[PDB]
Amino acid sequence: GDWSFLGRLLENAQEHSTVIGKVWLTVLFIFRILVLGAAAEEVWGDEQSDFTCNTQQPGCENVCYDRAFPISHVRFWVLQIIFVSTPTLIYLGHVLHLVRMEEKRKERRIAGALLRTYVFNIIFKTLFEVGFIAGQYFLYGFQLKPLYRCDRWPCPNTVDCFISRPTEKTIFILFMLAVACVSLLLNVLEIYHLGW
Amino acid sequence: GDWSFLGRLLENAQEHSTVIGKVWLTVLFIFRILVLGAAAEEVWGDEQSDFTCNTQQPGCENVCYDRAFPISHVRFWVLQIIFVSTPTLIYLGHVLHLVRMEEKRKERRIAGALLRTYVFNIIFKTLFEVGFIAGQYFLYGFQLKPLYRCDRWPCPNTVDCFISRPTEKTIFILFMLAVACVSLLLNVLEIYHLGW
């Protein structure tokens, strides 16, 4: 995963952002992207190769892994990172557009319409963070148990399947939840600093 | 398989039987019982152990062998031998009963009621031989093909299964059919010699 281009754009957003916004971006880079690439990806590397079911039925392990893990937590976190970054890019684009328009007018910061877009950016960021949190909760909860009981065809009756690294995965699930909640708190602080 | 007791009783029947009947009993001993024990049993020994199906499905080979071979030819031939022998034992029992009654009357061959029972013995023998022949035909035919196609659950879709020793088994199927037909001819000759 090469996050270079998103990083380069979000550092530009850092130049035009509030101090709390700069904190939020630093959290995104260090506690989400960096952890994901240095720690979590490895943890989940053997998610299917080390997933085992007590059965001689061909195809059962495939369908049972798929049912247990419709989307890997790491993929979900990648999507979450991209969506919570997107409004920042929208605001930065509006910034660059107004700067280029100003340069043109000359040939021939946060107030006004730019402040309205900034605050909308903070709102959409908040809603997307909340949505991904709640989706993670309703899909997986905040804990991975070692045992998964599977009755999906072709599996005969109910089969016992065993997860790879349930405890380490639970640790990182809770870590990422905490980081997301810290991000929400930062957004709320941005909207209370702007309000005040 | 210990045929000693049936043999001992059928040799008694040989003492009280017609010459053609003696031929029939000799055919039974030499061309059915002896072949079954010296040749066929061995041929069919690995009927299930060498039966193979192209599948990874647990249980498929079991159900496919069972469907292909609801009853092994050798078991069928054992039953046939016993049933075609049974009327002979009935006639011999009537003989011994009349002899013991004669000894009693003294204290205090084929005509009459004994001839009626003899001819009924020949009739039931014929009907049982015919019935087993026709049953063998409708169950298996007179040939075993190497390939058996099986769609019985749990087998997925249609599976290719392969028989042990199809050609040797076909040879012995046809041999036993020929021996049974010779027995029928002998019965018919008994009833035409008695008629004449």
UniProtKB/Swiss-Prot annotation, chains A, B:
User: Which parts dip into the membrane without crossing it?
Assistant: 1-14
In this UniProt entry, which residues form the Cytoplasmic topological domain(s)? 15-18
Give the UniProt tissue specificity note.
Detected in eye lens (at protein level). Only detected in the lens. Not detected in heart, kidney, liver, or lung.
Spell out the disulfide connections. Answer: 53-161, 60-155, 64-150
Superkingdom, taxonomy of origin: Eukaryota
Membrane side Extracellular: residue ranges: 40-70, 143-170
Q: Where are the transmembrane segments?
A: 19-39, 71-91, 122-142, 171-191
* Cellular localization per UniProt: Cell membrane; Cell junction, Gap junction
- PTM info: Phosphorylated on multiple threonine and serine residues. Phosphorylation may have a role in assembling connexins into connexons and gap junctional plaques, as well as channel gating.
What is said about its interaction partners and assembly?
A hemichannel or connexon is composed of a hexamer of connexins. A functional gap junction is formed by the apposition of two hemichannels. Forms heteromeric channels with GJA8.
Q: What does this protein do?
A: Structural component of lens fiber gap junctions. Gap junctions are dodecameric channels that connect the cytoplasm of adjoining cells. They are formed by the docking of two hexameric hemichannels, one from each cell membrane. Small molecules and ions diffuse from one cell to a neighboring cell via the central pore.
> What protein family is recorded?
Belongs to the connexin family. Alpha-type (group II) subfamily.
Q: What is this protein called?
A: Gap junction alpha-3 protein
Q: Which organism is it from?
A: Ovis aries (Sheep)
Q: Could you say which residues of the full protein are shown?
A: 2 to 224 of 413
